[PDB]
Subunit: 127 residues, 3 copies
């Protein structure tokens, strides 16, 4: 008998930025697992019975609330839209390039709950 994992989750409503004047709604689930303490797992509901799963560095999403960050597949930066603070998530794959807007307040509140489970700087205690 042993403690395998603690999970912190939330549901966010993201916007897929199609154009300057057009966006599509993308419900997303975020999960944090204390057994994988550097990571955040994201499920993007891109269709009724379709999902796309991405893994992010928790520290990249945390930094993305305050300043532009990331190289390679993922670029993150803060901004505002429709009178809300947002985190912009630019994703590159073999398939192509997508731009998503996450509500900053909801993202930050989820990261604060992950910090209560595993304070940043203590991830190594779990490995």
């Amino acid at each position: 008998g042993s403690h395998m994992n603690t999970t912190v989750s939330c549901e966010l409503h993201l916007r897929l930025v199609v154009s300057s004047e057009s966006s599509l709604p993308v419900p997303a689930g975020l999960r944090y697992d204390t057994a994988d303490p550097y990571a955040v797992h994201a499920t993007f509901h891109t269709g009724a019975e379709e999902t796309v799963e991405w893994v992010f560095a928790r520290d990249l999403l945390a930094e993305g609330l305050h300043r532009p960050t990331g190289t390679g597949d993922v670029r993150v930066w803060p901004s505002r839209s429709h009178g809300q603070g947002v985190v912009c998530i630019a994703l590159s794959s073999p398939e192509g390039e997508a731009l998503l807007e996450a509500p900053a307040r909801a993202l930050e509140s989820f990261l604060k709950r992950t910090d209560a489970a595993v304070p940043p700087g203590t991830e190594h205690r779990h490995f």
Copy 2:
């Protein structure tokens, strides 16, 4: 940051063929994961708080829409029942006969093919 997986799923109502006289309803989930691109995962809801999980070759379900196929644990073949096309799924472990509605099965496989065309699985 990295793309771990794309999932395509559907919910089917299958018929457990108990006998010629009587059959039972089995709600099932099918899921295709591009991280496991040769496979289809099936969850058979056999009881209120009970499931049976099977893994199939995608290509076996795809072939089963058109002709009889499989040896060992799984045999699949097309047929008709109550005026609908069905795929018959015979499963052996240490035996169950299931009927899947062909249209719904085929439309799920076509969505998996749009994500990963058969023949390209190895690119993933």
Copy 3:
């Protein structure tokens, strides 16, 4: 195609024993997988969008209905509280020490369903 797994599950209501006179409700999901025939997986719903996952030896929970058992992370023993038979579950991790009360009848009824799927003594047939 291969028959990966058969799952037997139940939802129980456990009491987290905070104090002599104070307890908190912990909804818990128990899952038995015939592909992992020695184990019971427990999900403790400790808040709206947080869970704590534990693995137990099925045989430890089974023994815990009848007598005190376990060394290390998990200690289990039968008892009574508010006139109902309970199994006491004491859990230790680097993170936490917890005392939980499970209703004995409901726990036993779940284990009997796992025994109908994989009778104790036959776990090895699955490997």
